[PDB]
Amino acid sequence: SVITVGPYLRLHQCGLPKKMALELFKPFIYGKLELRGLATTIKAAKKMVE
Amino acid sequence: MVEANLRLVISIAKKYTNRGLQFLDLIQEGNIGLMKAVDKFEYRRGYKFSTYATWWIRQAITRSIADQARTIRIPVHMIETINKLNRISRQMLQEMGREPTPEELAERMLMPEDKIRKVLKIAKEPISMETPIGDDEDSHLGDFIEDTTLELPLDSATTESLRAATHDVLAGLTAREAKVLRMRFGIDMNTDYTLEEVGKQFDVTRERIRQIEAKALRKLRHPSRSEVLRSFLDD
Amino acid sequence: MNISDVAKITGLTSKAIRFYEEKGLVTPPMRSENGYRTYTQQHLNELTLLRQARQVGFNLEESGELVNLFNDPQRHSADVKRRTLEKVAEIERHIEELQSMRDQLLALANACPGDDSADCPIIENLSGCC
DNA sequence: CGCCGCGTCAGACTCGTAGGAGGTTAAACCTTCCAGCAAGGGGAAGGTCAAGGC
DNA sequence: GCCTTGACCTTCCCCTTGCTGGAAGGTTTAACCTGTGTGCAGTCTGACGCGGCG
Ligand SMILES: [Cu+2]
Secondary structure, eight states: OOOOOOTTOOTTSOOOOHHHHHHHTHHHHHHHHHHTTSSOSHHHHHHHHO | OGGGSHHHHHHHHHHSOSSSSOHHHHHHHHHHHHHHHHTTOOOTTOSOHHHHHHHHHHHHHHHHHHHSSSSSOOOHHHHHHHHHHHHHHHHHHHHHSSOOOHHHHHHHHTOOHHHHHHHHHHSOOOOOTTOOOSSSSSOOGGGGOOOTTSOOHHHHHHHHHHHHHHHHHHHHSOHHHHHHHHHHTTTTSSSOOOHHHHHHHHOSOSHHHHHHHHHHHHHHHOTTTGGGTTTTTTO | OOHHHHHHHSSOOHHHHHHHHHTTOSOOOBOOTTOOOBOOHHHHHHHHHHHHHHHHTOOHHHHHHHHHHHHOTTOOHHHHHHHHHHHHHHHHHHHHHHHHHHHHHHHHHHTSOOOSSSOOHHHHHHSOOO
């Protein structure tokens, strides 16, 4: 991505646009949906995710 | 006699090294040309040997151009079709000032459309995996290719999950039906048995075997257990 | 002989001759080493016999039997003519029943008004309804 | 021996931009293999329509 | 739930006229004609080897 400034940050933190992370932590989430019984499977999980 | 006439041979090969393949191989087929021309020769006719030889040589090379010169094999018949096609095309270009139409040269050649179609579909040659598609040597065409062959890890895990849910359900149905259906559909082994063979393993029945299949369907139909596959409904 | 010259002499084509040889309907012509079917005056007249046999009406089988007749110089003109006459009879039956059919068609069609109608009486005579 | 010349090898990183070719060189005579048509007809092998006996 | 039990269907291969068309694959013609090239490639260049050559 492009970068800009967080002039309030606690430097060990970083800025981040969400949707990037939404792709990037995806199968994690799939497993966790299956774990919580919400979406017991993967296309169920994916449909909820979309 | 081999060493008599080599210079006509190279003359013709360079007259036809209008860029089909390459110099030397052509020249060498011409040398075989000259061999068989001499190896059978009729002297009684009283002409010059060389012309007899000449057209024999022409045929040898004008074959070997067309057999090879493509990693795809297109035997000769299609080749001369393409040749005469273009021999007509040049004159259509003049007397039209414009490119041809399939129907028009089909009429002039008196032969039908779909041949022309599949010809022009087939007439063209391959384009070199590492061509420079970039502006500069940015990256060649290789990057722009997909491995559209193997798997999806998503669908792989999904299929594992299908299997897990399915045998979990098979535990929930009759040992007889579940086992006999694992083998009747070939699950849990390599090969797929059929109606009578599964029978005469088990016992002679045929139609109550069918009705055992319908039984297991009723046991499975059961809108409480579908939900492990009611999403695989959509699989 | 030259196979095209032979097929034009008998009017047929080469695959016709080959079909007949496949059906064992003549003397076997040899090949040459290059593979040219060595026909003959024997095959000339066998093929002309087998040619007019079916134009007359003798099928692949009975015309093969006619070339058997020719290749049999022991042949008996009687059985030849008896089969000629059995053929006459079969053609007669064919003629008679084809004309019975014709007569039925004509009774259908002249019975039709041809009044460009949904009321086509022919078809409803043909169809088992109503 | 101490030049003179020739000959090989090297020549930052990451993103994306566009889809892309072209001109020409026998004809006849033969060979073998199969697709396909009417107009359907036999026939194998799974089935599948009812129906019984405990 | 063990058995057929009879009798019906659907599919799939294979067969019976008289050929026909297609595809792939072969072999010979007597007037002749005798050493390319054909567009490069614009010379990058400093360090370093080594061949010949004094
Ligand atoms: Cu009518």
